[PDB]
UniProtKB/Swiss-Prot annotation:
Its main location: membrane. Interacts with ARRB1. Expressed in the placenta, lung, left and right heart ventricles, heart atrium, leukocytes and differentiated HL-60 granulocytes. Keywords: Cell membrane, Chemotaxis, Disulfide bond, G-protein coupled receptor, Glycoprotein, Membrane, Receptor, Transducer, Transmembrane, Transmembrane helix. This is Platelet-activating factor receptor. Disulfide bonds join 85-154. It is a multi-pass membrane protein.
Amino acid sequence: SSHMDSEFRYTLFPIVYSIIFVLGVIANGYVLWVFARLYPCKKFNEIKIFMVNLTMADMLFLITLPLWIVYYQNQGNWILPKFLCNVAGCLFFINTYCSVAFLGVITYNRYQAVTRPISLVIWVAIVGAASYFLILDSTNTVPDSAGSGDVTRCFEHYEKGSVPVLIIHIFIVFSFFLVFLIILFCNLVIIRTLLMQAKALIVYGSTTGNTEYTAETIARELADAGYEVDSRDAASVEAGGLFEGFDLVLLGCSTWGDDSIELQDDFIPLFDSLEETGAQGRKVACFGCGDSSWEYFCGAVDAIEEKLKNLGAEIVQDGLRIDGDPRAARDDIVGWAHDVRGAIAEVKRRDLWMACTVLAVFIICFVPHHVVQLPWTLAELGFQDSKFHQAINDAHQVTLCLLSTNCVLNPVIYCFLTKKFRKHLTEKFYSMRSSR
Ligand SMILES: CC(C)c1cc(C(C)C)c(-c2csc(N(CCN(C)C)Cc3cccnc3)n2)c(C(C)C)c1
Ligand SMILES: Cc1cc2nc3c(=O)[nH]c(=O)nc-3n(C[C@H](O)[C@H](O)[C@H](O)COP(=O)(O)O)c2cc1C
């Protein structure tokens, strides 16, 4: 009798759900193709098997969409067995909040990376949540748009009697906004710490003044480009946490020795105690002066580069090696300082774009529906006006198909994540499996 319905949903859902089904499948397929390509070797069978198991999960949801298409096509009538309605809807819920958790985990881990670079599994939860749906009588019958003909609805009614809808709905909507708040401030802190003006430290060891000149040219290149440059001689520095509070550290040293590949006198005290500064997890660059007449051309460059690798430092650019006089190739020196910026700028752009994306997905996909839910549930339970009921029901049709776009957007995020966070991710995966 209370025929509260949105007639546009019977035309809006079959088209949207059939577009997000093809775009969904294509998106998921483009992930697998790209991933299986970037890891062709059998030594990476476990990272590929994980990527297959992720696609399989996404696919288990994508196969529920034709049921809804047919359900809406025949004007909101669930003809198929009732237990299938429990299954279809239960999988929507599991997919929705797993898509939320995963966009949460991407944000949290990028947060632990862009900031602070120095019970857990929810298996127990989604077991109780799924077993709740298994017993839920999701189906109610109501007469058709005309009358004298029962049309079965799937998850459209709230039986006020036995199920405590109100608290379950309040809990979930608040749990989402807690998660959204965490994503919101994690990402804004990421944007803020990336947009922070970069402070660089240049430490040079020079006898004849050649490394000193290169260090000056590099310093003028970064300062011109807006860096907080701290250029200091190796004889005026102390190994005690020298690199602390510096984004980029540029170490420069001239090669010496009649016999073997020895370092510059002022630079050797720093070399021996390079751990004490804070080399691990530090973006470092290594330039240096020399001569092609000797066997180890710029041996000092190669000496600190392999030593910083053993220290686990981030060598952002291929070390600068000068043949004789640095004034002879000032444009080649500047080129290296320009490239050094460029390489650090890309890593920043990577995380800027990721933070924006996870927010744009949250603000357009998940957030609109979770705002609409609490007013809509109350209206359905009969706690509001007639005019309002129609409005909140109509917007619910729009927000529900916007929340369904997660199908296509999460594989797109996984693609950009594979394509640009490859090194970090591959390391993370094989560290967890190394014990359990
Ligand atoms: C806890 C709360 C916030 C919440 C509750 C439900 C329930 C209606 C089970 C559901 C839910 C599970 S299945 C489903 N729908 C929408 C029904 N709505 C009209 C009440 C079934 C459905 C799926 C896709 C397209 N049309 C209908 N809704 C969802 C999903 C958005 C995850 C969230
Ligand atoms: C005895 C001696 C040994 C040197 N050994 C090397 C060497 O092994 N490899 C190299 O590339 N340059 C070597 N050099 C060249 C210096 O690195 C070169 O003079 C440099 O351009 C000057 O840098 P500096 O003025 O900043 O100290 C050596 C020079 C001398 C005099």
